[PDB]
């Protein structure tokens, strides 16, 4: 198992491409994204409502925080969105763990 940070970004659906681009530039090895609904309290939604949730597994905490900081500064003063982070362990993932595999021992 290889420790990882699962960065979750839940935001407005119109930001899908803009956020993916950031994730792609970050050096993160990939992402998962899904359609969700949400209700919030920040009261910032540009114009239950339909959102998207990204999940990005990163090798380091700093990479997760650099993504988070770049998304939030660039979009979250103007669009609704929340970003949080969970601890995970990756058991299998060719890209994430490299040809060497995620170990186990």
């Amino acid at each position: 198992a290889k420790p990882a940070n699962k960065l979750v970004i839940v935001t407005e659906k119109i930001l899908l491409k803009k956020i993916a681009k950031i994730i792609d530039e970050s050096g993160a090895k990939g992402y998962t994204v899904m359609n969700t609904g949400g209700k919030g309290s920040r009261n910032v939604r540009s114009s239950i409502e339909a959102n998207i949730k990204f999940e990005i597994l990163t090798e380091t905490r700093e990479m997760a925080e650099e993504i988070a900081d770049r998304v939030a500064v660039k979009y979250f003063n103007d669009y609704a969105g929340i970003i949080y982070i969970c601890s995970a362990e990756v058991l299998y993932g060719h890209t994430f763990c490299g040809p060497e595999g995620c170990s186990a021992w």
Copy 2:
């Protein structure tokens, strides 16, 4: 980063509004919800809620109200994960999550 509990409720889709109302009455600052499928032990369409709360007791209050009120008659599972919120105006206030 500000510590938080991520409460997850996976249950039958017809309970959507009822469960949202409980979440809204708990003091929680919001929720995310999605359509999912599932198999349990006696694929079918259901919903998953995710609710980030400031305290554990708020998460358990939501969980306890939902389960007592609906889980005798409807399928469902409720679990909780630890998270840290990095950005969230409502959840972390004007001062930000540097908490």
Copy 3:
């Protein structure tokens, strides 16, 4: 609260049944599954399973069987998170997730 491992499998949609059968053969009490997109426009459609297991070994069994069978040929990632189950009739039994003795 009853401790649990949440096993997450994100992989190609065509493995849905093959993976459900593995989950069912593990002893796991059930699973949640959803449609997602992923990059590893160049987003692709895939599925995500979430399986709460009683023990770590059951989670790793499911993970190992899936990966060994399918991940040479199909895209996928498998990870695990810690969870505590507060309510779940099947997962926690008739005595509930807050039993004492």
